[PDB]
């Protein structure tokens, strides 16, 4: 419950420093959190779709990598 | 010296250097870059020279011959 | 047998590049095209002896 | 011999600078991160 | 000169009539619909083929089409299409 | 008689089935795949045609102009999400204008 | 005398540190808790493998960093260093959303 | 006293006229000769019909109007109306090129 | 026909194109940028178009050839060659 | 195997078997699997050479996925070929905007 | 259980070009994903073009034009040349 806020603000500043930006506005953190929510919801939709299609109660690496490949991000390495 | 010329660069005067010019002449066996000290820069700019043609340069006389 | 190159048109500008006689940039303009040329200083002397100006073909 | 008349483009030509130029053909790339950051920050 | 070509003119026309027996059809729009149904069809078909290829199942059944539709079509149309197709399957099998 | 009539399906189940058989998809095809495919195409075509007819009738026309088709797919957010890269012939663009340029 | 760096100078060195590092910036427990919350409000009584979690966080940090240079380019186009809401909204709209 | 519309007044009406209309904005012959000459260098002796050209025309102007639209979005994000070079540069960069 | 054809697109054409795109003020440098990007798009499409045409043993490039050349790039043009 | 006498590393037999079972066409050519194996040799050699050069430039015998990601990145050919491809734990390029300094 | 990979193949390819450096396990997964990805991409493109000429047989020329079209000009021409040389030597 209310576990979405687990992504702390200094973490957001860290990924911002990954992108090479100096200053970050206040609304940016919660907007990024909303974008996170939408992105994970969209991914998990198709991930669990294949999961229940595969009559499995536990998710698998191949399931999510294939589901993401359907979208077109082409994750490489783990679960190749 | 003679051979196919592949690169010629010439720059205008700056406080750092009066004239900097680099040219690259490539032969069947060799391809290197010489440094142009003003006078040969003027000689090369006197007549239009395009890369990829065989030319001959006489160092003592300082004249340009296109083969 | 030989081939010759011919340039003609209306003059738009006379710009000398100036010890020595400098070259001149000419703005020859025809009805179907326009281009600029650099002229030998001997040609510059010759054309200036013609007493031409802007707008003279 | 020497060409008395040469085509010249005003914005392209400049007497200051004279430039002419001509298994897989690939240029050399430096993969050293230290060298790249040294070039970037200097 | 021409042997034969396949088009969805018939079924499209009866769809239009059973939903609106008053609106005419332009040929360019008709080609657009033909391309649209062709696109949807081959997308679903290739998705179902690879879908049989996930679990190494050599059989393609209505369940595979259903889950392919759920995965590619968004939730609303996914549930609508699967409900309609499932009901169609039940009554078609009941007809025997 | 055909299964489409007894199943009340307008689209041809046999044609879809034979397209699947020679469509190099799977060597084994169940009988549920063609009927499911015909049903889903019939639903999608019905919805698209209804929206296009609505777009045609709101423009004082009794025929579906391809521009009317373009608007019909464009107002619906869901149809926009379905086809975010397609180009519709003779469709033009939505009559969208920006509020900032308004004096 | 105290030795305090000018504002933003530490930003360059932390950028340098983070650019050479390929590690994830999200702790495992909050990420797992969020994914399990999505499962909980998604389908009851779901199980998660030890795998199928690395792909999640990996794709997320790739997407986030990508969107970050897009919004950085948008901000620098605006002739200002600080990012804002319109920058990220425009980047999202132009990327295909 | 001649009647002159102030600048920008007619722009809105051209936008209104063009947005409701879906006809090709490029003259046919210049486009077809452009296509012929660009296909020349790849391989000589080309052959084009009345069709196989309007498709290219339509794809082209659809792509161009989309590019102009998100260029307008970028220019609005720049707090100005007049488009400029960097607008189309970053629109192209952001859209996936 | 075979030389200096890139400038075939004219200033009023670009003005109409931008007006369709919604722009009301046009800069003085946009024209040849859009001309260059248009040329790039044309060569990118036409390369795959002629590849399809020659691999199919055809002397003419037809509407089907270009439409399914565009299909592989996600353009999936509708209408002609449906 | 025929690959050894043809100067092929990846086996033509396995590729032909995969094509037959890949649900592509009931008829598969004979020279097509050989051609495909040869082109796979080509790209594999290019990518391995680039990764090795990246590792050598970093003075590391080990080949970290950062080396491979750089091998993709500096050669624009591969970025055009792999635009949406993400390399696991490869980091990012050292890119800094000039105006930000 | 048994599972298939191109480990030894790219391994001795690397030893051929450079028998002095190694490749890691996650590098093995990266390379394996890369190879089967391009394999299936070329395969489906070839299937599409072969079936589109109303023909049900795929030959060397079909995959040849497939690799020619997917890859950029330099890779396309080099791959086509090396592949046709290999096939001509084979037959």
Author numbering:
A (entry chain D): 23 to 102
B (entry chain U): 136 to 202
C (entry chain V): 134 to 151, 161 to 199
D (entry chain S): 1 to 22, 43 to 62
E (entry chain G): 33 to 128
F (entry chain E): 16 to 118
G (entry chain A), H (entry chain B): 37 to 133
I (entry chain C): 21 to 102
From the paper:
However, in light of the new single-molecule data above, we re-examined these less-populated structural states in an expanded dataset to see whether these provided information about how nucleosomes might flip between different conformations. Two classes were of particular interest and resulted in structures at 3.8 Å and 4.7 Å, respectively. One of these classes (described briefly in our previous work) was very similar to the major structure, but a longer section of overhang DNA is evident that emanates from the lower gyre of the nucleosome and binds across the surface of SWR1 (configuration I). The DNA extending from the upper gyre is unwrapped from the nucleosome and binds to Arp6–Swc6 in the same manner as that described for the main structure. A third contact region, involving eight conserved basic residues (K319–K322, R325, K326, K328 and K329), are in a loop that sits across the surface of the SWR1 complex. This surface contacts the DNA overhang adjacent to the nucleosome wrap, but a different overhang in structures emanating from either the lower (configuration I) or the upper (configuration II) DNA gyre. By swapping which DNA overhang is bound to SWR1, and then releasing the nucleosome but without releasing the DNA overhang, the nucleosome can flip and rebind in the opposite orientation but remain tethered to SWR1 by the DNA contact with the Swc2 subunit. Consequently, we interpret that the two major states that we observed by cryo-EM represent intermediates on the flipping pathway.
